[PDB]
């Protein structure tokens, strides 16, 4: 008998192995970074110090034969290819012309991103976040940010999961023409423009990569040469702790909607498809595709663009083109994969579709009921408001009168009804439309006493620019704030108000604010209250359920109050 083999953990790579390599130490192209496998490379160096080494080796995995090669030293490293995920007990044999002498069993792993080979996620999640048992059919939606793990600290662990169905991943940006981006500053155009080099226009790609699959989180055990990290491993691992929980990638958004506008050229269309049939393959815990298109027909961030007789079309075209896609995936893997899509609910932005058309292909629309109102603008108003507003002028909710300049209203007013009502007017099935939830507000100043029509409604007012706070008061950007920052630092324990801000309700429109006369900071939001009556509302006229953004910005509150105005 030869000696029994005895395996080199440090020079097997720690016996981690994977379908997917991946790029750990640098920032580079897509394809340059991530290459999946239809086999995954094993390799493993064994020793054989004492004794003889034999002529043969065989390596086995749960006592199934899986490699075969030739021993011709004291030093020898098996190369083989496997096709299955998971974690197995390896041993390998020695053998010649008298018998054989298996090594000790070892765990190797094989890493594949379903999480195959992974525990279940354990969950760090704020007390705050109460339990509740809704009904499984009704959708409760968040969007989980990629950049939220930066400043923000909140990681995939924090998400109160029992509390949610659908998880959006937010954002898949696509590479092309991407000028709204450059505009917002700081890296995101620089990481766009390196994940783009040697990638296809109109393609998908992960925008930070270390975000999604490099960074170590000790919280999931994720230790060096662990093969998947970041994001997208922990939200592996939350597949096996929550099997039945929806992820789904949110492609585009608001900066990132440039490449869209070109969907009205076939070919465009093709290879987005396309790249986005390769992207579910690649990452196999994602369970569908959410289109972030802001707006067909223009009126986002990008000025120059929109076509509101085409984009109408081609985004129709291109739902019926990704349910195509998306079959073909269900046949291949017999699961259930979902096409859902987040649109703008202003009268301007719902008349450039035909939703009902689209929505034929479609799960979910997740209707946009917030940014009605902000800080682009010095014109006060509820950003995420159900109903018409006190402050809005006669003629205004159903846009058949007059402004105060005179000119008459192009169309009806920005609320989350009147959205909701145009979008069952042209023939969208209520059961597949999801209503929006803002987990932060959007803020204004300068909006002083002396600047309103109506002494008692600061939403008469007028303001000078948009509110300014620091990151510690969870202002990330200028004109919004996180909800958990107007609570600590607006509303306070009793939600009567600290810090010189006064709590006001909207009965009319079932929307929140807090107002400072002497500084004029404005912020409409969305509180346990307006939730109660958006939970009402859905379930009155039989909607999908409800979402919310961004997850990172509620304490629990809000999601509470989303949970118990469904019940």
């Not at 423009?193 to 999604?212: F, K, L, S």
């Not at 922990?234 to 608001?254: C, E, H, T």
């Amino acid at each position: 008998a030869p000696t029994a083999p005895s395996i080199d953990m440090y020079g097997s790579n720690n016996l981690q192995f994977s379908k997917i390599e991946l790029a750990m130490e640098t920032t580079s192209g897509y394809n340059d970074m991530v290459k999946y496998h239809e086999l995954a490379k094993i390799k493993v160096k064994f020793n054989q110090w004492s004794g003889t080494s034999g002529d043969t080796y065989n390596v086995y995995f749960d006592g199934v034969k899986v490699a075969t090669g030739a021993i011709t030293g004291s030093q020898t490293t098996a190369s083989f290819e496997y096709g299955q995920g998971g974690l197995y007990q390896m041993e390998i044999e020695a053998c010649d012309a008298t018998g054989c002498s298996k090594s000790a069993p070892v765990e190797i792993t094989i890493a594949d991103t379903d999480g195959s080979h992974l525990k279940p996620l354990t969950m760090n999640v704020d007390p705050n976040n109460k339990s509740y048992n809704t009904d499984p059919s009704i959708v409760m939606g968040t969007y989980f940010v990629e950049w939220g793990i930066y400043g923000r600290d909140y990681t995939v662990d924090n998400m109160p999961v029992d509390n949610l169905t659908h998880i959006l991943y937010g954002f898949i940006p696509i590479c092309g023409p991407n000028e709204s981006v450059k505009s917002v500053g700081g890296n995101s155009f620089n990481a766009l423009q390196t994940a783009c080099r040697g990638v296809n226009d109109y393609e998908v790609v992960i925008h930070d990569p270390w975000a999604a699959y490099q960074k170590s989180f000790p919280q999931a055990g994720h230790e060096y040469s662990t093969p998947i990290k970041g994001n997208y491993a922990m939200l592996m691992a939350l597949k096996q702790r929550n099997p039945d929980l929806k992820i789904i990638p949110s492609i585009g958004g608001g900066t990132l909607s440039d490449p869209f506008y070109d969907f009205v050229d076939k070919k465009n269309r093709d290879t987005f498809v396309a790249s986005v049939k390769k992207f579910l393959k690649t990452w196999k815990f994602y369970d569908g595709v959410d289109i972030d298109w802001e707006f067909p027909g223009g009126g986002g961030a990008a000025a120059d663009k929109g076509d509101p007789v085409n984009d109408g079309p081609a985004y129709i075209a291109l739902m019926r083109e990704l349910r195509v896609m998306l079959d073909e995936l269900e046949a291949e893997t017999g699961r259930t994969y979902e096409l859902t899509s987040a649109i703008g609910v202003g009268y301007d932005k719902i008349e450039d579709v035909d939703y009902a058309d689209a929505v034929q292909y479609m799960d979910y629309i997740f209707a946009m009921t917030y940014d009605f109102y902000g800080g682009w603008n010095n014109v006060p108003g509820h950003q995420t408001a159900l109903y018409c507003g006190s402050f809005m002028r006669p003629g205004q909710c159903d846009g058949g009168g007059v402004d105060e300049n005179g000119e008459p209203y192009k169309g009806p007013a920005y609320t989350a009804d009147n959205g909701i009502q145009l979008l069952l007017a042209q023939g969208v099935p209520a059961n597949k439309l999801v209503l929006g939830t803002a987990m932060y507000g959007r803020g204004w100043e300068g909006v002083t006493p002396d600047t309103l029509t109506d002494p008692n409604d600061p939403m008469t007012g007028t303001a000078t620019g948009k509110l300014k706070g620091s990151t510690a008061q969870g202002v990330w950007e200028d004109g919004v704030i996180d909800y958990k920052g107007i609570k600590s630092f607006m509303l306070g324990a009793n939600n009567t108000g600290i810090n010189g801000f006064e709590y006001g309700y909207d009965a009319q429109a079932e929307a929140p604010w807090v107002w400072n006369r002497s500084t004029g900071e404005l912020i409409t939001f969305d509180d346990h209250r307006s939730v109660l009556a958006k939970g009402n509302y859905a379930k009155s006229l039989g909607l999908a359920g409800l979402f919310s953004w961004e997850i990172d910005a509620d304490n629990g509150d809000i999601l509470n109050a989303m949970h118990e105005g469904m019940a």
